[PDB]
C-alpha cells in the first residue's frame, strides 16, 4: 500500500523550521505528496507511525545536516529507509539524499563533526551502531545533492524538479 510520494527525513534541531520547511512546500507545489512529521513525540524507540509512513512512501528525501547522526530517531528511520530501498519492489523505494551544509564524505565515512555523534553512543547501542553506519554509508552512495552556501530557493527548485521528474518516471 502507498500513501505518500516522499517521506521527509531530517534533523529537526537543524532544519525543521527553515530549509526542510521550504523544501516541504516546494514539493507540495509540484503535486508531490509528502509526509513531514510535525507531531510531538516522546519515548525510547522510534514512533511506529514513522516506520509505517516510510513503508507507505514511494521514496524518501533525506536532509542530512551537521547533527543528523546525533539523533537515534533519525538513524533508526534511516535504517528503515535503506531496508526499504533494498528489499521493497512493486513499487520500489527511491532515496534522494541532500547533504545540507555537510560534506558528503563526512556522512559516508562518519567523519568530521558529523562522525563525532557516534562517540556519544555507548555499549547500550552496540548492536545499533553497525546498522547505523551501514545505513549512512549506503545512503551517501546514492546520487544526491551536495548543498554548500548558496541561493537556497534555486537549490530547492532544482532538487524538487529533479525529484518530480524521477518519481513520474518511476510510475
Ligand atoms: N553516488 C554518487 O553519485 C557519488 C558521487 C561522487 C562520489 N561518491 C562516493 O564518493 C567516493 C569518492 O568519490 P570521488 O573519488 O569521485 O571524489 P569525491 O569524494 O570528491 O566526490 C566527487 C564529487 O561528488 C560529490 N558527491 C559525493 N557524494 C555524492 C552523492 N551521493 N551524490 C552526489 N554528489 C556526490 C562530492 O561532493 C564531490 O563534489 C566514491 O567512491 C563514492 O563512494 C558517490
Amino acid at each position: 500500500t502507498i500513501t505518500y510520494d516522499v517521506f521527509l527525513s531530517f534533523r529537526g534541531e537543524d532544519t525543521r523550521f527553515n530549509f526542510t520547511d521550504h523544501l516541504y512546500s516546494a514539493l507540495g507545489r509540484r503535486g508531490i505528496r509528502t509526509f513531514r512529521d510535525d507531531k510531538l513525540r516522546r519515548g525510547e524507540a522510534i514512533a511506529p507511525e514513522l516506520l509505517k509512513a516510510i513503508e507507505e512512501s514511494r521514496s524518501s528525501v533525506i536532509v542530512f545536516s551537521e547533527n543528523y547522526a546525533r539523533s537515534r530517531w533519525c538513524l533508526d528511520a534511516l535504517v528503515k529507509i535503506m531496508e526499504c530501498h533494498k528489499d521493497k519492489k512493486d513499487p520500489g523505494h527511491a532515496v534522494f539524499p541532500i547533504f545540507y551544509h555537510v560534506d558528503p564524505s563526512h556522512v559516508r565515512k562518519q567523519e568530521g563533526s558529523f562522525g563525532e555523534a557516534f562517540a556519544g553512543y555507548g555499549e547500550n547501542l552496540k548492536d545499533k551502531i553497525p546498522r547505523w553506519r551501514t545505513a549512512l554509508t549506503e545512503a551517501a552512495n546514492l546520487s544526491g545533492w551536495p548543498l554548500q552556501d548558496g541561493y537556497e530557493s534555486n537549490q530547492i527548485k532544482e532538487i524538487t524538479d529533479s525529484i518530480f521528474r524521477r518519481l513520474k518516471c518511476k510510475r
Side-chain angles (χ1 to χ4, degrees), residues 64-66 68-69 99 101-118 133 136-137 140:
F64 283 124
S65 48
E66 192 180 39
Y68 184 96
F99 310 94
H101 298 350
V102 284
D103 203 320
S105 81
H106 284 187
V107 173
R108 186 199 331 124
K109 303 172 127 283
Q110 298 93 64
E111 264 163 18
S113 76
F114 189 98
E116 291 173 25
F118 285 87
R133 296 193 186 275
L136 284 157
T137 297

Side-chain angles (χ1 to χ4, degrees), residues 72-88:
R72 316 151 174 66
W73 284 47
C74 291
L75 297 181
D76 281 338
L78 180 61
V79 165
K80 178 68 182 203
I81 287 157
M82 296 318 285
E83 284 174 356
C84 286
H85 167 90
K86 281 270 136 273
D87 296 326
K88 267 134 190 53

Side-chain angles (χ1 to χ4, degrees), residues 1 8 27 33 40 78 96-97 99 106 139:
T1 168
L8 210 33
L27 292 163
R33 199 153 145 63
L40 183 143
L78 180 61
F96 309 109
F99 310 94
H106 284 187

